[PDB]
Design a protein around this motif. Structure first.
Motif: not given
Lengths: 50, 49
Positions: B23-43
């Motif tokens: 579940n923590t890994l799934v939450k991490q994907l939601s986190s932006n990590f300083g990127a404009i969008s969390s989703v790689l595809n959106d960027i």
């Protein structure tokens, strides 16, 4: 004729198909600036708000 | 054993810990990590490569 920079005019465009490829191909503009989105991307990309 | 699930609770807790890590890994994907969008595809869709 257009409004001043202080009185900037914002127009909503909706329910239309938008292509930026023709604008880029003409290259009438001396300079092109893209930050959040980019020109090559605009053609393939679909934008809900214009 | 029927009255209390506490005896098997420790085994369940180990399974819960494994589930929490996934579940923590799934939450991490939601986190932006300083990127404009969390989703790689959106960027990728909005920006040059």
């Amino acid at each position: 004729r257009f409004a001043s920079v202080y009185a900037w005019n914002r127009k909503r465009i909706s329910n239309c198909v938008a292509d930026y490829s023709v604008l880029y191909n003409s290259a009438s503009f001396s300079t092109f600036k893209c930050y959040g989105v980019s020109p090559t991307k605009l053609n393939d990309l679909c934008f809900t708000n214009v | 054993l029927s009255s209390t699930a506490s005896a098997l609770g420790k085994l369940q807790d180990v399974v819960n810990q494994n589930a929490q890590a996934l579940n923590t890994l799934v939450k991490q994907l939601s986190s932006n990590f300083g990127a404009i969008s969390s989703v790689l595809n959106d960027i990728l869709s909005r920006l040059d490569p």
